[model samples]
Target chain A: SGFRKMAFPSGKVEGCMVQVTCGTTTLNGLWLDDVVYCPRHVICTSEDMLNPNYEDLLIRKSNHNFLVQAGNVQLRVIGHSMQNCVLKLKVDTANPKTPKYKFVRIQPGQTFSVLACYNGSPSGVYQCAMRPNFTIKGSFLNGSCGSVGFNIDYDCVSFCYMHHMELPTGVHAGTDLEGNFYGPFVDRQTAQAAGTDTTITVNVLAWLYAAVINGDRWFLNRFTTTLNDFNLVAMKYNYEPLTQDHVDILGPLSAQTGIAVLDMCASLKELLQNGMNGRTILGSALLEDEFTPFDVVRQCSGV
Target chain B: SGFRKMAFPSGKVEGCMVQVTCGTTTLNGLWLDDVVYCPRHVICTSEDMLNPNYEDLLIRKSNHNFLVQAGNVQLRVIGHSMQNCVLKLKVDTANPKTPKYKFVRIQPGQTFSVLACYNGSPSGVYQCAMRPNFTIKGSFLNGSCGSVGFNIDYDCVSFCYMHHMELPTGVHAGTDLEGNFYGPFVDRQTAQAAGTDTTITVNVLAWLYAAVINGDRWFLNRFTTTLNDFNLVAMKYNYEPLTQDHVDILGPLSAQTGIAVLDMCASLKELLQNGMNGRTILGSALLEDEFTPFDVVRQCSGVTF
Candidate 1:
């Protein structure tokens, strides 16, 4: 029910040829050349989502709640539909001299059942119409697909999850927390030339070398395993499955040889837990001079 | 000694044109027409690294040890040099059918000293030469510039540093450990329909909303603070300073309006520490079932620390 409220009510069916204009600018990419309706609901099952009749496409406004002008731009969708539906969106903004109208098409099933944001405040109804060669008025749904200008820092999303957090004791374990840069840090000059106290320097690097390299196979195996595990966790967490595009990007990392190159954090943790010589590494002058190996692991692992 | 072993020694300087052949194929993107060395090292001091000679490029072999057929692909540089160098790499594979050499230019100072990998093994001496138009001998260093076929998933680099790790206790605290997806996850059905046990779900989502939205200004402020801190910590860790290009990408995230959209992990941590709930939300049954607000702060902050 909330999904219906968030989305504009669906309009009557129209054939799949439509005209989309933004301030007299005819937008491209929204038109469909053919139309076909599924004979049965089962005909256009989830399996056909990737290949569907452009005519049988469904268009509904997203329901993610956020203010129209308060900088929280949002609109979302849920549930399954024929994969061929397209939305030709034209939103009128508050600014007239700047031209409020913008037009674009959402690819069929590309970003399914998700609130998509336009990052703008629209003064008028954000409109969506099915491609129709017939009468256009009945086929269009208008009003209250409101959007507010907002920006997303996708890069920050990557940083928050991938980079290690600074420990309560203020030490960075194996990798730079913010830099996310991973490389060889075992050379003596590197340890001495470090900007922070060498206490963290010696402990983090030694543990990384001993734990990460020694158990490279473990990391490689685990790295590939987790790519699938992540989506399962998402479904478990009740979030939309990560887009196929996102998974496509991650697929190669786990499938390849340098799992260490990509997943240093997991490698470091695995190494500490299972690797030998934790004491030998901690006993060195550089490590023993400050924190113990146990202390470093506790801090790094957030245990 | 290891560096020398890994790198092919530099050959004699040629003006700025050279032939690079890989098996039966030739690579492109390293040629320069008007290459010019900086008049003085002072003229091309560290600052000039950002702006270097298109003609005065220098190329060196990386020092990270790996076999021509091994998987470890590495080479790196530190400090400063004239920025105009580019590498055109061509690796000959065992297959006579498909060629693996590729041609591309490295930015003036993009990767100072890092083993750059090209995922295929090239036989013979991996070579580097300044382009010399007419003279073949003027700019060719041959033999022992060893390179192996190795591939790096740049996405993995991003994932490794940007994503969180699953704790030994099997919980992802401040952020999504692997998916790294960031968006509002607070609708009633969203909270209720969640498939995972909400022990972590309730904790993570509530913390993200409070920490990310309420103290938006705090995160915005701290976001800017980390760019410099990242480099400082980088130097302290003895890695190369993140190149200016890297900083340029990070600079906008801190400067812009949606800094709150990202960095929710820090904000989540910061808010839990402060222990002040701004407003009561439609928390799930799983959430209210757990510890008091105080318990959350300690649990999330790793009080076991």
Candidate 2:
């Protein structure tokens, strides 16, 4: 409804007030006075979540649990749609029940760099990244980020996800860090340059690639299929049980895709068991390396 | 003042009743009754998250964002602390802003099952796993679970995280799935047998290991140190920019450790760049493989990220 009329749902006739209000609740799209106001969220009956590019599109939150705000920063220049851009991340308290763990409010003009720690949370801000249109959020790199504040790195991520979002066609991915600067990436090739041994580097990049390209059905299909395939074995047998990281990342990844993930872990397990999808993507190398080491070889004689 | 007093924080004397009350708030532990009530959560000033073993210990939430309930299930024989052992996962409705994205209440006997999809969430439960004392949760394999419900698998994870938790010293890790059955485990061994390829299989297990062992300080130390080491490169340069998956998993991994993670992502970058911590635990293999491939060769001919 806001400059993105082309992306609005079909059949919404102009000046046709389809939104019927009940007591205290407003439902459906309301087209009154030359504007189409759709629900803050649309029912994602079909897989692909509402288009991320839909200006003013509403979804209480993006797929990655990053609370969506009044304005967003899209992958564009000149009109860098990133109005009111802020990255709000949670500094984990020892407890999840801390009175207020939900999205913190931001004033209209106030810039929110970090989610100050609360309820006995460690002093620093937990790492939170904002990918304008995706649900992938906050990589839980706790140790360092939590010990101290990570406001600048957040910008790298906030800017990068969008840069990644515009990838294959985006000029921002490898742009220099000093200017709007997203480090450790030209940035993908550089993730490895950061020196995280090959194994972890390989998988994290695969996951990151999917995280950034979630809106594209083709890539999402592969990402979901790969994850589904991986989860099939991972979820059931521990072939590398999918991590919460996978889920939090999945929060936005699966929803934004054109279709909701079809194969549940069980189904995917069956598919993999049956050799259906070529190779399901194995996630979280941390998990993969840990489980399969021979119990006897590593635990006993070998040690 | 909960049971297992050892897990509670130090300094709050038993009968002192240090909780000074303000007009609207009551701070510190209120030990009016014989109970040694401590703060619902101790500020995680140290590395490790509050001891997951704390019997009546309180935290606003657990590390993995699995909204804890009145009771929890510890690795025990006689007492199943899982009083309110219900899995409440979010069914993404496209809009996190859709009304109430926060925790929903469940009456004591409500027997909570699935969190029905609302606000346009594709009708199904998102995959949610619970390791009683750890923070790793909810593997986001959205397709199957979100499209349909996954109650049974929830139990598998619930049982498994705990099974894995009491490990190297416990007997539940690979216990038969049929009997309180934790599938595909003697659970660890079976994760690979589920039919995934070797590449994904190996990496996932390593991550799963860190996720489950998060409560053990020694193991947690390794996990944090490794993740810290990995994030050094991962968070900064595209070397492997950390993903939300890493963050969510870290939600509990770093916090639950006895010491709060020290190096910020930036610092970790410095550490890894400096070749410290040996090798950080590379997470989410998905990212690793995607980035390194060249664009001209791959995009022009190879066809990749």
Candidate 3:
């Protein structure tokens, strides 16, 4: 038995090495070294995705297609670990293929790639899926510093996602001549100081506070919740509906906070429904009035 | 003390018809009868900034400068909590006539639409300063659901300072075809999953994660720390950087985690320095090979490296 180890049907280990015999039968010749040196299974997956972060997605619009590029991906498998896993992906192309999506099993530490063509037709939002043969448990302990790239494009907005194994503690991107810096800036203080308005200032600070204290958890939770709206629309992405609990916990300042953002959204809806008349329910005055308990009011209005 | 309350610093107790101070204190005697009350300070402040949330900012590209309309902004005070705060915004218009930008004190729960012009080339990073009336620790906060809709004659890349505030969580500027979504998706998984390899996916997700998650910190700490060549590059009208830390953090296997990534970077760097060929490095079944240890090679060159 190569790298032989004994285990019970219940998955409990019996010992480092235990030999057993079948009824009136002998087991095949086994070498511990052979088992120990078994080759890892390799799988390759390809994806041709038309990122929805930039171009308009609505079918009614003129630009209704995707200009995508395909890339190859891989995964490794170990024993039966490949089961229960799902590979979510697809080939987003032109020519019209309905429900052309599938999920494949991937091996552990396996290297593979996906290939798909970019049919540059302004298709709003679409993506590929995969089911790899690996389960990442334990902790994806992110160091104190982890950064992500952000690209603002004509087609879709791009933001990188990290494995739950390591929550991004901080990130950085870029900036322009306006002395303005674009980024996944993990520094809440820096982000808060980046803008001249109250909404930007408060939002950045709140995020910064959460980053310093709760680290990645705070940043991810807040970003996923409070900022998910604009992100979805801008990046042409989708998100699961947030629960009532999410909003209640993050505070009502940001719509992504998941707190009954209905009111906050209602206020924005009111603004959209009235920005043309230049008459908003909560005028800009509430944004900086000290004595006014309008913090809640403006939070409900200011974008 | 005519109509002023008998309390220190002055304020009213709820559920009381108590007298309050208002209008040039000279009107103390003008309290003819039981008239509706209003604070002079409140009225004055309101008149100065009707809907304080609106601000005009100039967008200058090279020698051609134009005033772009900027709306939906929020300023967060960073240092202290004070009654009155001053936010001074100056544009790097590169012109000698760049006027000084000024705004009134930002009271709690208040938003101001301070208007300013940008005459500088769209290639320089412009910065604004915020001066507060009282030292109460102030930090700027910014948010936006839609683009400022500036007349985009040229590529418009806008970025704010670190102390200013992160940009608002943005929604995909959905194509003209499918433009139902505005942004601040409310669900990133749904968004990211829906936005794989797509332009909107890359841009929107990056921007959202940057702005919503405290852009500065996330870039500096998490993503850039890998082995990839991602850095922040600052340009006029655009603030994007790519640093060494970024290169290290986002290398080929950047997305990998756990012990798998423990020493992966050092290995890549070593191969790079040793004149490794691209194809070999790219196609080396080593990627599919299991973890292994090296002895004669530099300690840092191990697979775990």
Candidate 4:
């Protein structure tokens, strides 16, 4: 009987070692401009979510010069000569088929001609769901400017949801007993640290470009797949797989309809492979999203 | 003149009103398993990450019963008779092919038959990557159990990289007059709150499905697409389109090469639509990932967890 019953690797391979060696003092004592190119630009890999940054699972935006592309589908803003009262089209019926004239030069929320209007027979300002309705002073009477006020109707142009991570560092007030002012205490040190952390990061203009797919389905599938991938790694490593911990998993976090969610050994391998270059570091995890802010430091000793 | 030009709300309507009203106290309650189901189980909507939860961008795992499913790809543990050695197959060549013999009964780390063996001549134990090498007592002679040891190599069974997140709530020690535990201060309050927050939540068996697709492309495309969707929402909601905030976007987060990442108004709409049921609430957000821990509460009105 030569068949001692040899085993096979269940189609799975070795998982990575999530390195938390990077400490909390990462990105310290540096100027903003010096590190992190911009306050809005965030660069990171899915493998570094807690090992370093927040993946798409969290909030993230790509900073571009003038052109912003979603994945590979690029959408550019075009200026119209007619200046049809810079309207935020609730419904861009003139897109895809035409595609070019979809987006206009008007910034969102900006009053589109709050003071002026076209010299029409009976038109002027209009109400909008995107902004406070504005009356373009009614259509010019016999080529005259302000004769009366008029309103207009609006439509629905479908688009995407966006997040803005801007903190008014300068929005402060009077100081009381503490060295901090009112409103929101701008922790310059924290700001500077985050900036520095970004400065030495990677992958700018963070945009994905996979064509042909249901939007939500795409994310749902990959995220859970990634989770399963991580679980495999954990199972091999000292981890028992996150899908089992009831005591530590948060309600909202655990409520996620997926396995869990990177590359760890390669990350560590790459980390040591390419150490810090000056006052910049591409990766540094103070702590993972696993531990609470109060206890992560002690929980994740690699920090 | 006939009429005037009009406007429309491109398929995208008003986003959510990311209200940081909870002021970082969404969960501050009794004890573990009190608010949350368990430490490994984190519950939240794709819309709560910053406004509240981390969606799918950060670390999140679903705590389940003896069963675990990837979306709907449920995998259960079944004990075997032969005890042919508790081995973590490198390659589950046996799965889907036959379907029935997918998972065997073996806790990943527990050594298998390290002290005993069979009555065969040239047989017993092996080495593995999932753990340190272990030698099984060789085949038994004349029915006796003990003998010379032998080694066995493992396989390449594929799986996920599951995150643990289990911090040593007790691996702490004395304080150097700092009033803090030397190991980990066991932020009992934070733990309790997170627990409480989970306790009064929804969609426990956090599992997504929507079967059929190229996994990676699915995530890449969706993430960026979500970014644009958010951009549109932000455009209307007083946001200047994050895809343009060079000054504030973090490199890694931005480096994602994806737009940004949720839901709003309806979240707020639904949030207020269905207020807190008890000490347990459906949804509540203090801050977002937009700010660092040191400054989140100050920066996001939410605590950095």
Interface RMSD for each of the candidates? 31.1, 26.2, 34.2, 31.8
Model 4 chain A: weakest 10-residue lDDT segment is A12-21
Q: Tell me the spans in candidate 1 whose CA falls farther than 4 Å from its real position.
A: A1-215, A218-303, B1-26, B30-305
Q: Which ten residues in a row are the worst by lDDT in model 3 chain B?
A: B1-10
TM-score for candidate 2: 0.19
List-wise, what DockQ does each model earn? 0.02, 0.04, 0.01, 0.01
Flag regions of model 3 displaced more than 4 Å.
A1-303, B1-149, B154-305
Q: Model 2 chain A: which ten-residue window has the lowest total lDDT?
A: A1-10
Question: In each prediction, how many residue pairs overlap at the backbone (N, C-alpha, C within less than 3 A)?
Answer: 40, 118, 261, 151
| Model 1 TM-score, 2 decimals | 0.21
Per-residue lDDT for B88-165 in model 1, tens only?
222222212212222222211111011111122121111111111100001011111111111112111111100111
Candidate 3 on A26-125: residue-level lDDT in tens? 1111011111100001011122112221112122222112111211211111111111111111222221211121222221221111110011111001
lDDT, candidate 1, A29-74, per-residue tens: 1111121111111123344434544344333222121112212221
* lDDT of prediction 1: 0.22
C-alpha lDDT of residue A230 in model 4 = 48
- Candidate 3 chain A worst ten-residue window by lDDT: A1-10
Candidate 2 residue-wise lDDT at A188 = 20
Identify the CAPRI category of the predicted complex in candidate 4: incorrect
